[PDB]
Amino acid sequence: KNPKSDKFKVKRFHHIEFWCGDATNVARRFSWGLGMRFSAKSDLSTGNMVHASYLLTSGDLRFLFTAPYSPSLSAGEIKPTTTASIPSFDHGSCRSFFSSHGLGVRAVAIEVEDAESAFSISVANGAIPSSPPIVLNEAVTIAEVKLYGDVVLRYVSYKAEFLPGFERVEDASSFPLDYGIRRLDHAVGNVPELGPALTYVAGFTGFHQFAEESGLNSAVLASNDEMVLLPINEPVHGTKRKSQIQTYLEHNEGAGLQHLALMSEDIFRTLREMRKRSSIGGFDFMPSPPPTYYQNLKKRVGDVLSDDQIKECEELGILVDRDDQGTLLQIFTKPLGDRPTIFIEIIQRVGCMMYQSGGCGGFGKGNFSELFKSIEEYEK
Amino acid sequence: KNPKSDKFKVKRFHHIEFWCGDATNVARRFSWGLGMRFSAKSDLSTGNMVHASYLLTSGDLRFLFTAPYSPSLSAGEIKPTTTASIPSFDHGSCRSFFSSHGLGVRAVAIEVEDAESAFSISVANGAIPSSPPIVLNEAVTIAEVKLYGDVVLRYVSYKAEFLPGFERVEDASSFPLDYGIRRLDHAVGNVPELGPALTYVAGFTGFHQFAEESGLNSAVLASNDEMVLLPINEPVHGTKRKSQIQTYLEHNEGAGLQHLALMSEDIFRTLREMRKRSSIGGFDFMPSPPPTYYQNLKKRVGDVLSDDQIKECEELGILVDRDDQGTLLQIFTKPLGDRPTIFIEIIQRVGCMMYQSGGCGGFGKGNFSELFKSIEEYEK
Ligand SMILES: Cc1c(C(O)=C2C(=O)CCCC2=O)ccc2c1C(=O)N(Cc1ccc(OC(F)(F)F)cc1)CC(=O)N2C
Numbered sequence: 001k002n003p004k005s006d007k008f009k010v011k012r013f014h015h016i017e018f019w020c021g022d023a024t025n026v027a028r029r030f031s032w033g034l035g036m037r038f039s040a041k042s043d044l045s046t047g048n049m050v051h052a053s054y055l056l057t058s059g060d061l062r063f064l065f066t067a068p069y070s071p072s073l074s075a076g077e078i079k080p081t082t083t084a085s086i087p088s089f090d091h092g093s094c095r096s097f098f099s100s101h102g103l104g105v106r107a108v109a110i111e112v113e114d115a116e117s118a119f120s121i122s123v124a125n126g127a128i129p130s131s132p133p134i135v136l137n138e139a140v141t142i143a144e145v146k147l148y149g150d151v152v153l154r155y156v157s158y159k160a161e162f163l164p165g166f167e168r169v170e171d172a173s174s175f176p177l178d179y180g181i182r183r184l185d186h187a188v189g190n191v192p193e194l195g196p197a198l199t200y201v202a203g204f205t206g207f208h209q210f211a212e213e214s215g216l217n218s219a220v221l222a223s224n225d226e227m228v229l230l231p232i233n234e235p236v237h238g239t240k241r242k243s244q245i246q247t248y249l250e251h252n253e254g255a256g257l258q259h260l261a262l263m264s265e266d267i268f269r270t271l272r273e274m275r276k277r278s279s280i281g282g283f284d285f286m287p288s289p290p291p292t293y294y295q296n297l298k299k300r301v302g303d304v305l306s307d308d309q310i311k312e313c314e315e316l317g318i319l320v321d322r323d324d325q326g327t328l329l330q331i332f333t334k335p336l337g338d339r340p341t342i343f344i345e346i347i348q349r350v351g352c353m354m355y356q357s358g359g360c361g362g363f364g365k366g367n368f369s370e371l372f373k374s375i376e377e378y379e380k
Numbered sequence: 381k382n383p384k385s386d387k388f389k390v391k392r393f394h395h396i397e398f399w400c401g402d403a404t405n406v407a408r409r410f411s412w413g414l415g416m417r418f419s420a421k422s423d424l425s426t427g428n429m430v431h432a433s434y435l436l437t438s439g440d441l442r443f444l445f446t447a448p449y450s451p452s453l454s455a456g457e458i459k460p461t462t463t464a465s466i467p468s469f470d471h472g473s474c475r476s477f478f479s480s481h482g483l484g485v486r487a488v489a490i491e492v493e494d495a496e497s498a499f500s501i502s503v504a505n506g507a508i509p510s511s512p513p514i515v516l517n518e519a520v521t522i523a524e525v526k527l528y529g530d531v532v533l534r535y536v537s538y539k540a541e542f543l544p545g546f547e548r549v550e551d552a553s554s555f556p557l558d559y560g561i562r563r564l565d566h567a568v569g570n571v572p573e574l575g576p577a578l579t580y581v582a583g584f585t586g587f588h589q590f591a592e593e594s595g596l597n598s599a600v601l602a603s604n605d606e607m608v609l610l611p612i613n614e615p616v617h618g619t620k621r622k623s624q625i626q627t628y629l630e631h632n633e634g635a636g637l638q639h640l641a642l643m644s645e646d647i648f649r650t651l652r653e654m655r656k657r658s659s660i661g662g663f664d665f666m667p668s669p670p671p672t673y674y675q676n677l678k679k680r681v682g683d684v685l686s687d688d689q690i691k692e693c694e695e696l697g698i699l700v701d702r703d704d705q706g707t708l709l710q711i712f713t714k715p716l717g718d719r720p721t722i723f724i725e726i727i728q729r730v731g732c733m734m735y736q737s738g739g740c741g742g743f744g745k746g747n748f749s750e751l752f753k754s755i756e757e758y759e760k
């Protein structure tokens with residue numbers, strides 16, 4: 001049941017912004033590891049004396065990496081005279097965020113019809129304001145409200161090239177890397193208490209609950225066409241094996257974004273390319289399931305995937321889950337940085353053709369039990 | 381003239397330590413960009429609840445990348461019970477350093493015969509103490525004094541594998557990258573006033589002055605065998621074109637390490653490999669000289685380098701300088717991070733065979749004028 005209760009018009013995920021200590025090194029690492037190209041910049045060379053911001057793109061996926069300069073470079077400025085291209089940026093907020101949480105997602109940005117109205121309606125409906133609507137060059141409006149922890153939900157709306165003040169990147173620096181990633185499928189938060197988190201976010205967005213012992217309870221909020229998907233997890237406590245949600249909250253100093261799920265047009269090629277680069281600057285992947293897991297795949301998805309396609313999953317460590325509607329291929333990186341906090345999921349969905357409807361195949365929750373079984377079975 | 385006046389026995393450069401916001405992402409970027417392998421770690425997986433530290437090696441070159449965890453993980457600890465493998469580490473010092481200077485070198489470490497005696501003699505002779513001598517596992521002693529700005533000179537001495545508490549890295553993560561870099565040739569500081577900086581450092585080390593308008597004055601301090609080389613620069617002010625030393629001091633919030641010079645066993649192969657990777661996660665290089673610079677090379681080094689070897693320099697943007705003793709091939713990266721502060725130099729030296737004596741060919745100071753001339757000549 002989709003009651004289509006969005007309180008404002010939401011379009012798609014727009015971008016994800018990482019707050020960094022050094023944006024250059026994080027962005028270069030991510031670019032090589034994920035196959036995203038450098039597409040825009042806002043920094044000293046564009047007249048920004050406040051923050052360094054670099055944009056990577058792959059298909060429709062946009063990753064933004066931002067770090068503060070010395071406040072001394074902009075000490076003469078006031079907000080009316082700022083050279084920052086992202087007016088919500090604040091040196092002290094950014095340093096406090098990074099000291100508290102380490103490397104992670106500050107902003108989950110969605111494109112909306114009218115960011116000012118989305119902001120007003122959100123706050124009218126319980127949203128805690130974070131940055132008021134600001135119109136950039138009479139062309140783009142941006143506004144921010146609190147989502148969970150120190151993560152903000154950022155609204156962006158265009159009258160009619162990322163943001164004013166960003167420059168498109170010189171082709172010599174823009175190497176056309178592409179490993180097949182195409183868009184953000186969902187963005188997931190970890191919180192101490194799921195109930196209040198859900199009530200708050202669904203309260204101010206109108207997002208509805210999307211239809212669904214090892215660590216967590218979770219629920220998923222979705223926009224009208226279910227293309228914006230925001231799962232939220234809470235720990236289950238005292239569980240024999242320690243909850244990965246609780247470990248997150250400890251090392252992150254509280255709630256924050258747990259993982260970003262990146263849809264690939266060809267997950268086999270994406271994983272081949274990412275795995276070639278794991279030990280030369282890219283990303284590592286979580287330990288693969290035992291062969292029993294892939295022996296058990298035939299009985300569960302043998303009508304969706306051929307033997308060769310199942311064997312290809314086994315080579316790459318890919319996990320498979322299935323719903324009543326569709327099938328999900330997925331795999332998880334190790335944490336992106338020093339702390340066991342944020343990681344990335346690569347996914348591809350099979351089914352639900354209408355275009356493909358959102359959330360086709362679910363989020364892989366069936367893989368908790370099927371993994372656990374596989375390990376005890378393989379213990380043989 | 382080498383009066384060999386070291387006040388304690390100094391051996392070689394040992395390692396360079398970067399203080400980072402996220403050590404994982406900086407270390408992965410540097411590993412790919414410079415061809416250094418992951419050789420040791422000290423982090424949560426080794427029982428360190430204080431800091432994440434990763435060591436890259438190439439030949440004798442050791443780069444250490446360190447970042448703090450949440451203080452909350454180690455809140456119960458006191459220095460006698462610390463899980464930190466580097467006892468001089470301090471959460472607050474590290475966050476203050478990074479907020480103030482951005483990504484950069486905290487420690488220039490040299491191996492000495494006896495770090496405790498080097499520390500005592502240094503402080504007896506004017507050195508400002510930074511961290512007192514601490515013996516690690518009855519095997520290694522480490523101590524630190526202030527060098528310039530917030531950079532420390534770290535003494536390390538071994539009774540008889542990097543440091544106790546570091547683990548050697550799992551071979552699956554240790555991809556044997558190697559682009560030819562072999563050791564640290566020299567480490568260079570920028571200061572507001574050269575005179576007091578020289579007097580201070582030469583005062584407590586016994587290092588002697590090593591024998592030598594566009595931006596700077598400089599002087600070089602050297603150990604007895606001139607294998608530890610510490611150049612120091614100061615700006616020249618009001619100079620038509622802005623001093624790169626002054627730009628450094630502005631963006632770095634004062635004095636700090638300007639560049640690390642990395643000797644290559646084969647600078648042509650190193651530059652080929654680094655340049656292939658510039659736009660896919662590695663390092664960029666400063667703008668190459670015009671062809672007039674390479675036309676003028678024949679008259680200056682045609683007895684050292686063949687036409688093919690000179691043409692190979694031209695393909696790679698390599699600079700050449702020469703002394704009365706030897707010849708220097710060199711080239712400079714763009715800044716390593718967001719701020720126009722620290723960069724890296726790749727070098728190879730020809731001549732001074734005895735082994736090769738240190739500083740053979742100088743530091744490239746003749747390339748300031750020869751570059752400037754080349755640009756005006758090429759303006760034609
Ligand atoms: C984050 C995550 C998702 C996931 O995407 C979401 C959502 O999107 C929304 C709904 C909640 C949800 O969680 C889906 C599957 C998943 C993980 C995952 O984090 N992990 C780490 C992990 C845990 C337990 C473990 O032990 C064992 F139980 F044996 F596997 C080993 C690794 C491992 C793992 O295996 N799967 C299969």
Ligand SMILES: Cc1c(C(O)=C2C(=O)CCCC2=O)ccc2c1C(=O)N(Cc1ccc(OC(F)(F)F)cc1)CC(=O)N2C
Pocket residue numbers: 566568594596598611612613624639666699712725743744745747748749751752755
């Ligand atoms: C740091 C540095 C060294 C260097 O290693 C040291 C030492 O080790 C110890 C002794 C002091 C010393 O400086 C040597 C050569 C060098 C640079 C350098 O930083 N730079 C940037 C730069 C400046 C001016 C410029 O304009 C023009 F003058 F036309 F070139 C363009 C780029 C450029 C450049 O060209 N050379 C040739």
Ligand SMILES: [Co+2]
Pocket residue numbers: 186188259261345363
């Ligand atoms: Co997921």
Ligand SMILES: [Co+2]
Pocket residue numbers: 566568639641725743
């Ligand atoms: Co140099």
